[PDB]
Amino acid sequence: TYMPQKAWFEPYTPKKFDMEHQRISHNFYNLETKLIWTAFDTPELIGILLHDETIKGAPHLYDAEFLESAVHWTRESRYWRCIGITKPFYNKTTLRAQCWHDRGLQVGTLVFSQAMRDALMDLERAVRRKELGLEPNYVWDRWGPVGFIDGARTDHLPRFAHNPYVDPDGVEVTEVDIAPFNTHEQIKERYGAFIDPDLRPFEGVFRAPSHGALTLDDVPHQEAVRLYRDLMEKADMPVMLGNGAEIPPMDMRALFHLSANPERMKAASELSSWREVRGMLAPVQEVCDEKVEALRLMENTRHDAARVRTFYEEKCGFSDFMRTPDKVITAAVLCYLQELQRICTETDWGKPLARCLTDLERVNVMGKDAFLVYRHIEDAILDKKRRVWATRFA
Amino acid sequence: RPHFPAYNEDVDRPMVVPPDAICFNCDKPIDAGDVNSYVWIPAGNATVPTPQGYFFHFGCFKCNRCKYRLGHNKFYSKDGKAWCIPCALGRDVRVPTRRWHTSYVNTHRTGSRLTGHFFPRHSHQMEFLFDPN
Amino acid sequence: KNSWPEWMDNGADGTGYGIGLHRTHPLSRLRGNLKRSPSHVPRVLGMMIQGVWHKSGVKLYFRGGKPPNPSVHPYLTGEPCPLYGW
Amino acid sequence: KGGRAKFGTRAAESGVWNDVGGITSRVVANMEQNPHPGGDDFGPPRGPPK
């Protein structure tokens, strides 16, 4: 079997500083470097990073300035990744994307490598195909975290002259052709369509109610699901007797709000129709759905990386997070950052809720009913997973 | 000791470079006789494509799937493309220790010259000579 | 370990850039691999006479002909880098 | 001993008799084929700090 020998543990203690400049330099170095490396390698784990640093004693993480820096570094990290940069930092003082050679060909031209030149060759080939009108086959759109999305092949940059890239349409690119494209804005105005993601389809994803693969069978209150089915049958609409039925998330939100506290369930069961059952919950549900969704999107993403993967899959409809392309991944991460910014800014209660890390403090800052609903939902998820584990064991 | 003839006689069926001639991995035209940069594999067959032997470029005689050289200088034709035996049999991609993106092969059928069609070709061609008619 | 940096043993570049015996100024803060101890004389003589064979297939410090004189090399002035030359 | 008595199987026409004139360094530069042989820290930083 596998057995670890021993693991060390370090106590969480906030760093003390005698003067202000020391604290400024420390927070800059530590937090900025960690955030940039995260946004470069795996920008999804920014929430885990923020949670860990707040646990270690970083108070100013959930501020508007830090969140703006985070989204800016995420956008620039996507830009660098599309350029073909491997390491975000050339030195501890300056970034790698801000290195200009002097006394050479140009004094402000970014210092390019052969890998960056080949990536610009790919970009220019895609742009020339787009201009000719035929289907532009950008090679790195099928590139993901685990590797290529569909092709089990292996590719590596820079490509040599013995095994170069072949184009069935005959479009050719050359370093002599890319030579004028040397500055950041000049290459952005040309290859913007391939470096920038698309965040439009996600504008209403994080603000919409969702459940972690929860269905009517996994509802903890059999009486609640049966009374919901009886109301839907009293209404002139057909019902599905099978456990795997498609129920709307807005309706399942009210179902969980009912099943959380039994008083409201008994008060709503005597009503005539599910229409009235949702109407009587509408006033209290509006002031709690936003809060419970915010709490869920922060908790399920600040604890473990696998939970972040599952959350992103469930909310974006992705089949596999290792198979989905990196552009839409970056788009979803940026939209999640914008959602966190909205929660922190537009709502005054969001910043203390984000700073709170324990159940006691989250109950103190959150409505008791909303916390009960959220705990019931997450406990239903945990019960489903535990039943799956029991079926595995048996 | 070698047990194969030298200077194979093509009086029965001459093997000449055609005027029009494309590749197997590339389907692009090649040089006819000015440069031997192509690889000629003759077998004396009019079977499609490229009768009396297909042609390959030196750089492109490699496998088309894994883009690697050949093991024993033997390729596998797969729906118009040339694959390697590990690729055709379905085995995993094996990176060779020697040259990667080019194989050991001579130019202008020099490596495939010691085997093929020789003189006489058929049995009815010898009796044509030994008979007075 | 060694006092001199590790790029003098194996340069940071894949080609082996920055290989050889580097002399430093007495008042300088950088440190080189030119040492005259009875333990360092073997490797110094090896670099001077035999040279150094890199795994890429090239002799970096002394291919052949006239051997270099590390006592008269100009003083070391820095370190290599992948971005710029030096 | 094969062939010659002092030289053995080492034929005069094949190779050099003594390929060590003075000293020879058995070490080969970058024999480990590491991606970055400049040291533990050199040039760009590797991985996030702490």
Partner: peptide, 22 residues
């Protein structure tokens, strides 16, 4: 580590030798 970026092989003496061979 886990890094989402373009496939980039480090410049290895073996890679330099293969390029010189080609």
């Amino acid at each position: 580590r886990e890094s989402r970026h373009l496939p980039v092989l480090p410049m290895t003496p073996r890679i330099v030798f293969e390029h010189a061979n080609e």
